[PDB]
Amino acid sequence: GKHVKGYHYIIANLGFTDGDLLKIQFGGAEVSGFQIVDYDDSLVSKFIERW
Amino acid sequence: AINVGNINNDKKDETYRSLFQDLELKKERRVILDCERDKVNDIVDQVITIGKHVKGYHYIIANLGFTDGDLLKIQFGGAEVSGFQIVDYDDSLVSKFIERW
């Protein structure tokens, strides 16, 4: 129970959304990370469809 | 007292976070459940997702199947949990029954 409102974590990899992330989406603790593969970029979306 | 019966399976996670953003109004650190064992394990899970199980909360499970569910998950949170059990697993009549079951 160390993920409530008060704790703050930093993911130090270029794959934030690569791993499972929803598990702490509602813990209240703010979570920040890094995304090199911007799933919002156009090239990646057409890639995701085929993927 | 909060009616938790009338809910469907699709809009389940929404009406639950809103139920504890409503139990957060009373700052209710002491909650009683009093439901069937199938609905017990479903309620337990969403509590851990929001994080209402650290040192400060106290829950009372109102059914005869305390150990009949799974309890090792909420065993390291911090809150006090209470319940009721009728099947004594230290009796020789149940031991001679558990040794065969």
Curated annotation (Swiss-Prot), chain B:
Induction profile = Down-regulated in the pyramidal cell layer of CA1 in the hippocampus by global ischemia.
Glycosylation annotated at which residues? 80
Compartments in which it is found? Cell membrane; Postsynaptic cell membrane; Postsynaptic density membrane
- Tissue distribution: Detected in forebrain. Detected in dendrites of neuronal cells. Expressed in the pyramidal cell layers of CA1 and CA3 and in the granule cell layer of the dentate gyrus.
Q: Which domain of life is it from?
A: Eukaryota
Summarize the PTM comment. Answer: Palmitoylated. Depalmitoylated upon L-glutamate stimulation.
Self-association state and partner proteins as the record states? Homotetramer or heterotetramer of pore-forming glutamate receptor subunits. Tetramers may be formed by the dimerization of dimers. May interact with MPP4. Forms a ternary complex with GRIP1 and CSPG4. Interacts with ATAD1 in an ATP-dependent manner. ATAD1-catalyzed ATP hydrolysis disrupts binding to ATAD1 and to GRIP1 and leads to AMPAR complex disassembly. Interacts with GRIP2. Interacts with GRIP1. Interacts with NSF via its C-terminus. Interacts with CACNG2, PICK1 and GRIP2. Interacts with GRIA1 and SYNDIG1. Part of a complex containing GRIA2, NSF and NAPA and/or NAPB.
Protein family (similarity comment): Belongs to the glutamate-gated ion channel (TC 1.A.10.1) family. GRIA2 subfamily.
Describe the function of this protein.
Ionotropic glutamate receptor that functions as a ligand-gated cation channel, gated by L-glutamate and glutamatergic agonists such as alpha-amino-3-hydroxy-5-methyl-4-isoxazolepropionic acid (AMPA), quisqualic acid, and kainic acid. L-glutamate acts as an excitatory neurotransmitter at many synapses in the central nervous system and plays an important role in fast excitatory synaptic transmission.
Q: What remark does the entry add? A: The postsynaptic actions of L-glutamate are mediated by a variety of receptors that are named according to their selective agonists. This receptor binds AMPA (quisqualate) > L-glutamate > kainate.
What does the entry note on its domains? The M4 transmembrane segment mediates tetramerization and is required for cell surface expression.
Protein name, UniProt field = Glutamate receptor 2
Q: What is the organism field in this record?
A: Rattus norvegicus
Whichever gene encodes this chain, its name is Gria2
